[PDB]
Amino acid sequence: MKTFRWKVKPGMDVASVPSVRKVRFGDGYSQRAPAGLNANLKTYSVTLSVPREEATVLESFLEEHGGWKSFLWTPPYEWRQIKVTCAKWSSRVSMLRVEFSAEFEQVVN
Amino acid sequence: MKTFRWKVKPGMDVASVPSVRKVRFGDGYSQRAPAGLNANLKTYSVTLSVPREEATVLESFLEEHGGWKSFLWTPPYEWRQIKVTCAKWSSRVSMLRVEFSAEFEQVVN
Amino acid sequence: MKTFRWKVKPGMDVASVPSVRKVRFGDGYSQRAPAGLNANLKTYSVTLSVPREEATVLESFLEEHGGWKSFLWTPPYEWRQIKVTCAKWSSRVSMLRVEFSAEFEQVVN
Amino acid sequence: MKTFRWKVKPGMDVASVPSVRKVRFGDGYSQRAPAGLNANLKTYSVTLSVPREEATVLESFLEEHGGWKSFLWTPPYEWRQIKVTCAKWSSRVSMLRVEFSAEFEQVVN
Amino acid sequence: MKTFRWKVKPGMDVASVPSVRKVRFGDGYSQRAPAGLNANLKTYSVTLSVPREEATVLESFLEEHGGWKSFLWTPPYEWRQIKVTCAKWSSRVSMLRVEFSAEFEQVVN
Amino acid sequence: MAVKISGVLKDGTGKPVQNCTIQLKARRNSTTVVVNTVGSENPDEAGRYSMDVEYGQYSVILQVDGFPPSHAGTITVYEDSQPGTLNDFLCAMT
Amino acid sequence: VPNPTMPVKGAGTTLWVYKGSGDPYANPLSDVDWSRLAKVKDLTPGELTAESYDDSYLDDEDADWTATGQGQKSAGDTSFTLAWMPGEQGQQALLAWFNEGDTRAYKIRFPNGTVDVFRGWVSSIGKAVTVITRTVKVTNVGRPSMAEDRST
Amino acid sequence: VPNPTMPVKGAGTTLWVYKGSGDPYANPLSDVDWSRLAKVKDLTPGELTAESYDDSYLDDEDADWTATGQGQKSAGDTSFTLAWMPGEQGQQALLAWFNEGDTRAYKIRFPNGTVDVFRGWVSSIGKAVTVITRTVKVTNVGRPSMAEDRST
Amino acid sequence: VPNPTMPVKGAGTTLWVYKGSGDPYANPLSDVDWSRLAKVKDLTPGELTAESYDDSYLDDEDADWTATGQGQKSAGDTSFTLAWMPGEQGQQALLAWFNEGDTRAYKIRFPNGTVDVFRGWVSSIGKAVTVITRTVKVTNVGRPSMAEDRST
Amino acid sequence: VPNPTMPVKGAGTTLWVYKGSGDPYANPLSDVDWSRLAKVKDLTPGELTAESYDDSYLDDEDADWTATGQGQKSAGDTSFTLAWMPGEQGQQALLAWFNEGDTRAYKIRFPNGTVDVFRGWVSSIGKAVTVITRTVKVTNVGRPSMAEDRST
Amino acid sequence: VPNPTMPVKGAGTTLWVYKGSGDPYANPLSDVDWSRLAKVKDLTPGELTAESYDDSYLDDEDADWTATGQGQKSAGDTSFTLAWMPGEQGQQALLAWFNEGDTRAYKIRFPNGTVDVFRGWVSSIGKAVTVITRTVKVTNVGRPSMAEDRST
């Protein structure tokens, strides 16, 4: 299982929607349940900007795992060493630098 | 089999969505498979700009291939000699030079 | 058959989507066909700007054909003498000059 | 039948979509018919600005007709004395003047 | 039956769509009817701005009627006093002044 | 009276050019020509053209269903000229 | 002698404002009705500018050279500074005109002999506290009649 | 002798601020209640601007000339610099007024004899450290009564 | 002796406007038909600008160096101030031309001898009231013919 | 004696424009083909600027301090004012170059002994009235070869 | 005698640029490795700006008073003009550094005795053609070390 040590540009976005079991009654009394045992799984929106020379290397590494294999990655400063997978990535190639804008969806083992 | 040697302006966009067989559990363990052999097929958005006198030539080329015939093309600096077909292109005839915006979809033989 | 000799402003649009027969197989190898023989038919977006005095004249001519008659019109610099119909003309009368923003759809004989 | 002698500010918009009987085939030969006799019916978008004193008068006049009664109106400089009905109008009361934005749909007697 | 006396900021909007019975015949001859007797009922969009001290007072008054009670309100400069109900309101509390946005839907007795 | 302008139109490689269209755009009102008036003439497959041109000033336009109209020149017809090819007037001293 | 074809220093340059009813353009040479303003410090007249509209076309036989036409010409803004004269009726009328706010016509006369007539509404009133002067600026509306239209 | 119709140099030009309760416009000529500000270095009164609203129309018979009317006139901003004085009660009241921040009325008196009353709220308090001076400016609100209304 | 290859001070610098019908570029050297404008105070001719279009490409060997070309060059704006002369037919025709507003051709001549011809439309007519002068500016349209083309 | 290691007042500073075909960078020290321009009033050379790109990344040790790198260095715009010389061939060629509009190479020579070569296209042409001067501005394209590159 | 706690005129003010490999901050007092730039005409060092982030809160006791804190401080831009002198290796290396374009460290010394060290990349190179001089400016990146940190 590989890792991910590439630098991340500022402005990373984080999203989290816990899955809950909502049901409402006459005057409130809404029963709520946590649904799955580990419900909420954060999804990150991460952008990078690298010169063209190793754009090929980054593309090859992202190609190796495809859209099914997972890889360990440590979010910046965050207390956890999570494992993540991605299935969408795009690049704006210029004549000096290329910027990647991908999304990283956290999955458990 | 013809080729494509026209130059590509900066800002050409690259997209990639590999095909996977998502199937979900209660929580986590979501099984994944690599689907077919050639999963990901990059999609290119290419912008060009040519003086008016030249434009017709390019048009005829894109007319000759239609949207059903493949032609070799080398993405800038990229290690691959991919084969690509196009089915969407537009242009802005302003006063002197016309700029084209086209989409190029990668296809196996 | 009438002819269209009105002069057109910069920023005209040309769009082209060829009609192709696409079927995708197991690992690629998509069969592609040209569909109809004259698959490609351009669509132009044409804007004029004329003073109000002759504005009525345009409407009269554009009223004569309705949306069911075709008229010959040579696009600027283009090597073709094509026949084209329009059904969605609109005008912006402001003070002295009215600008017309119509779309011209190419049609076979 | 009353009339409409209020003046109209610059920026009035005119739209025209004549009715035709489209039907699509393999390679064009799209047969066309003029549909009804008076197929096209211009739709006008009219903007006015009056001081608040007579805003009530204009509103009462427009309310009297409702959205079911026709009234004569002469489009600016246009060679036709058309009959038009309106069903949408709004007014932006700010401090001193109020601007009315209304739509006027042409209709035969 | 309470009343309304809070003053209104410039930019207030008013819209009116009279319900009519439109039916189009072969060539025009569009039969139109006024539908209901008092079909025309205006809808206002009203914005206020008050310091935080009376924000509670305004909120309590708006809460008392809920969305099921009507209250008399005299629109600015208009002649007939009307009775109105509202069912949506929002506010922005910045530091000192809270600004209120609401819609007032005129209703019959 | 109208001078007879007749000739054969060829490209730079010594072959006839087809699908042509010669227009004469009037610039000044004459005894029998109004300003802003055009007259078309489509030649044969061999490039043969023959027109009758009234005296006055015109501007030649070569629409080859292709490149925009070309200022091949302005041509003046006084009451002394003789019938000849089109290129003579364009090459003539003005 | 007041007569054109020789340039004029322009020392007098009186300023008048209409007070009556009728056509100010009918005969501005008669000062029977208009009221004069006294002790104008400095004056800047209006600027008759126009607007540019696009005229370039695709099939034009001359390219790489822009072409713009002229349309919607508008008058400028006039400004003048007077000695603060609260006692005089002229300044009282001027301030009443500002307060009530209608379009009014006025003219400026030259030692050459011809006059220039504008019409518009005032928009700014200013002041100073060292040798008090009042600065007043107006904006014109509609077409004015220049001095040339009278000389023909 | 203080009287209008003649120009005035403007030596005194005192500045007063209201303290009591009542109508400032009822009789500004009496200084029984207002407090004077002492040793003002310089003053610049506000200017009464306006707003221009479009008036052109499609069927208007005269084209090629813009048409604009006047509406929503507003008062200007007053400013003055004086000698910074933490002792006098006038500046104490001025700073208390700024800190509490409510609309208040004030006036300026001229050597000619007429007085001008404004009402507004203060928005700046400056300072300098070379011959200490305090600069203060206010923005007006509502209609000010010009000096040309009392003369009538 | 008026001839090029030596600098000239520019004393005469006459200005003419076309009145007849024909081709202004056919022979600008003859003043048979053009009308002179008298006693110009100063003149600033227009400048022939251009506009840059991007040319940089990906696969070009030279990176980190911007590349751009020219396209759609346009003529400038001419301005000149003369003595305000409501008597002579020159500015009468100039103001009638402005009021009616069409494109017209004009020319400037040098003590040098060489002649410049422009064509355009007028967009401003100013005035001053201290030694009365009229300032007028025009914007050019289409291709102008410089003196260098004539010199060949 | 022309050589570096001592400052130069910069008196001569001739200006040349390439005319022939080949590599201008091959041997700019040879003036066999280039054409000199005569009596340049004033000159301002181009400015070799660059662009800044963001290098700071979210994961870093040194925080609260910006970090930008360099990319896309670009040449500036050259300008020179010379005496209007409608007879000399050099500026006839210059105006023909502006009219037709292709990229051309030129150079400037210093009394120090070394030369500087640029390449670009002309975008502005100006003029005057008294002691007529022509002002020409050009914009460069691609990398230039400075004097230092030849000095080694 | 060079020592702090009294002002210095600033006569010498030498400028050095790093050439070797190591830590510039380790000991800037030794000039054993860096090269000096010769005959700088004038110099403007960069200024250490900051950035203000909002801190105003709802429930805070204090209202009607904005609260702003500091974050993400950045270095400025340094500029200096020398006597254009391609002979010396100093500005030769400077131009090679610009062309290759990498971040480099440099220092400014003072007659006081303390040294300031910066690191950054150059962004412009200028020139003049009257007593020829070369103007060059750089932008710093990362934290610089001020002279005060060394005095402790």
Curated annotation (Swiss-Prot), chains A, B, C, D, E:
Disulfide bonds: none
Protein's cellular compartments: Virion; Host cytoplasm
Chief location of this protein within or outside the cell: virion
Record keywords, A-Z: Host cytoplasm, Late protein, Viral genome ejection through host cell envelope, Viral long flexible tail ejection system, Viral penetration into host cytoplasm, Viral release from host cell, Viral tail assembly, Viral tail protein, Virion, Virus entry into host cell
A GO biological process held by the record: viral tail assembly
Family to which the UniProt record says this protein belongs: Belongs to the lambda-like tail tip protein M family.
Protein name: Tail tip protein M
Curated annotation (Swiss-Prot), chain F:
Subcellular location(s) per record: Virion
Taxonomic superkingdom: Viruses
Subunit note: Interacts with Tail fiber assembly protein.
Function: Forms tail fibers that play a role in primary attachment of virion to host receptors. Assembles with Tail fiber assembly protein to form fibers attached to virion tail tip. Fibers are about 35nm long and have a thin, uniform diameter. There are presumaby six fibers per virion. They bind in a reversible manner to host molecules, attaching transiently the virion to the host until tail tip interacts with LamB and injects viral DNA into the cell.
Similarity remark: Belongs to the tail fiber family.
Protein name as catalogued: Tail fiber protein
Species name: Escherichia phage lambda (Bacteriophage lambda)
From Swiss-Prot, chains G, H, I, J, K:
Signal peptide interval: none
Keyword hit for Membrane: no
Gene Ontology CC: host cell cytoplasm; virus tail, tube
Compartment(s) of residence: Virion; Host cytoplasm
Keywords assigned by UniProt, alphabetized: Host cytoplasm, Viral genome ejection through host cell envelope, Viral long flexible tail ejection system, Viral penetration into host cytoplasm, Viral release from host cell, Viral tail assembly, Viral tail protein, Viral tail tube protein, Virion, Virus entry into host cell
Keyword Nucleus: no
GO BP, one annotated term: symbiont genome ejection through host cell envelope, long flexible tail mechanism
Main localization (coarse): virion
Superkingdom to which the source organism belongs: Viruses
Description of how the protein assembles with itself and partners: Multimerizes into a structure formed by 32 hexameric rings stacked on phage baseplate gpM and gpL. Does not multimerize in solution without the tail initiation complex. Soluble major tail protein interacts with tail assembly protein GT during tail assembly.
Described function: Forms the phage's tail tube composed of 32 hexameric disks. When it encounters the appropriate initiation complex gpM and gpL, it assembles in hexameric rings that stack on top of each others. Multimerization ceases when the correct tail length is achieved through a mechanism dependent on tail terminator protein.
Protein name, UniProt field: Tail tube protein
